[PDB]
Swiss-Prot record, chains A, B:
The active site is at residues 41, 145. Cleaves the C-terminus of replicase polyprotein at 11 sites. Recognizes substrates containing the core sequence [ILMVF]-Q-|-[SGACN]. Cleaves and inactivates human TRMT1, preventing tRNA guanine(26)-dimethylation of tRNAs. May cleave human NLRP1 in lung epithelial cells, thereby activating the NLRP1 inflammasome pathway. May cleave human GSDMD, triggering alternative GSDME-mediated epithelial cell death upon activation of the NLRP1 inflammasome, which may enhance the release interleukins 1B, 6, 16 and 18. Also able to bind an ADP-ribose-1''-phosphate (ADRP). It comes from Severe acute respiratory syndrome coronavirus 2 (2019-nCoV). The chain holds residues 3264 to 3569 of 4405 of the full protein. 3CL-PRO exists as monomer and homodimer. Only the homodimer shows catalytic activity. Interacts with host FBXO22; this interaction promotes the proteasomal degradation of nsp5. There is a cross-link at residues 5, 90 (Glycyl lysine isopeptide (Lys-Gly) (interchain with G-Cter in ubiquitin)). This is 3C-like proteinase nsp5. Residues 1-306 form the Peptidase C30 domain. It catalyses: TSAVLQ-|-SGFRK-NH2 and SGVTFQ-|-GKFKK the two peptides corresponding to the two self-cleavage sites of the SARS 3C-like proteinase are the two most reactive peptide substrates. The enzyme exhibits a strong preference for substrates containing Gln at P1 position and Leu at P2 position.
Amino acid sequence: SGFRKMAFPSGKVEGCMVQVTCGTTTLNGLWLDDVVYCPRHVICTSEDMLNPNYEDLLIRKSNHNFLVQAGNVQLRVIGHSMQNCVLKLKVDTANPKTPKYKFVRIQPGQTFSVLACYNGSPSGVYQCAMRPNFTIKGSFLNGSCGSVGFNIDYDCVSFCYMHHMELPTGVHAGTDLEGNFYGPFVDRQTAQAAGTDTTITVNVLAWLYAAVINGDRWFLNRFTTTLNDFNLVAMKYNYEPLTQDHVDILGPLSAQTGIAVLDMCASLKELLQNGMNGRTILGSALLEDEFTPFDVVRQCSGVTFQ
Amino acid sequence: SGFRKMAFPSGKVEGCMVQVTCGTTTLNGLWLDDVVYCPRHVICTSEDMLNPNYEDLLIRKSNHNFLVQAGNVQLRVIGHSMQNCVLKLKVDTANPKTPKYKFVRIQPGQTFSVLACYNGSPSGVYQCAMRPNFTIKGSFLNGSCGSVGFNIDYDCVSFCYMHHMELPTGVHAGTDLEGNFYGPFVDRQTAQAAGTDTTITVNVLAWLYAAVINGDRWFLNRFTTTLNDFNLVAMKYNYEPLTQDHVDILGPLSAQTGIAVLDMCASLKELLQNGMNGRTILGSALLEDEFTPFDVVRQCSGVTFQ
């Protein structure tokens, strides 16, 4: 029993974390095969970040201007390239710890595990989700840029995020492993708005399904509702509009617990309109939307990786 | 910025996880040097768990009755021994991935990272604390026994927990790596009480110190209080009695934020007496006590490991 915010095992990703220094700016890099991926603003100074021309700033840089460090071992850069907002550093050595990997671009609401790193060394690992405004609520100090988010399929690491920035609201933003930002954010030290943060409705429902599985079921009401009527209440509370695909994904969870998806939507509707009255659900005093439906199925069945 | 429940990198512990099968019972084991550690009730059947005589049940077992598996490789058991509630299986092979390690017995309130495993393969990693009643609130399905909790000091893994049981209250219990249980729990399928669960007061204060560092500071009141007067309110809410050692540990946090420890105790006192009025602190709608003061200092300074 028990249900917790769980992160994937980070061992396979630790072997791919290196330090990247250019000039006097340092951050983390992802070393897969003979290529190192890092945020492109490693070439910028503090003055450059106010308004950088990355093409012009990169022209003044050669292969020997990039200090790629893996423990005590220096890596020889034999080629550099800018793919959107990430830098690709070709090195003369393949990573001996390269796992089976792919580069995927996750959709809003999907979760992934972040391995926070500083100077190419891992400090911790935690789980977070792509908010509908394409931000994430993580823990990132200075030097944490280059840290990657990932999912694991048994033996295949699915890289999907790389940290680039902290918005002035204390929230974070970044790119995929091809350099394309999640959302309307640019790697530049200027004021940027994150947009309205909405709640991942399908994730709250799966979380409520996990509570029922783990004995916590006081919130189960006596009502039901419809998709269009529940969405009328979801809009008033800035919740993501629930669709039939969201209902389809919650099917296995609805079959295991015997609670129809529309019945849980009414229990969620009453929780929005009446609060929670000081009680708790799975030890949380609010509604948790950072658990995808597969996050619940994976935890309640205990799938393994290596 | 940002503050999250973070777990240590699990890579060094993944290399020490093996599968242990005895008869038709299987669980996880910890393979360090030429010794494998596993919960001793791997020798029990479902009928044996109701009231086992582990000494008598172990006598009928020899070295070849233990199937220690590490991936596809079988390990040859050349010796077995019962140290309290754990079994020590001597094998003919040292673990090539043995990290620098120690066996420590943590005190109540201390936190550690749990690496959940099934069939000797890691499934996830999460952070939890030793509750004052010597339980933990984790996520453990059948087969998760043998999973270990640990802390990391740069390059030294400090093993401190191994999962053995789930109490009928849905909460968990286990031993250290020497076989001694945390609390008054015995590895036997009988009704056992966990005792009154109190709140780790010094951990809530450090968590409130982390919120002030991360901009969330609305809870800072205009009052102060004394140690004996705050403990009078702490007793009414089943909070751990705060001592001068607890104040001493919160010193560095009190110096960085400029808030005296006694001032924060009054802000915590008002949060206990008046609730939280629907607001949130660091995204949580209740008081979080699973963050030690060093957990805050470590996250706000970003210490690394390898």
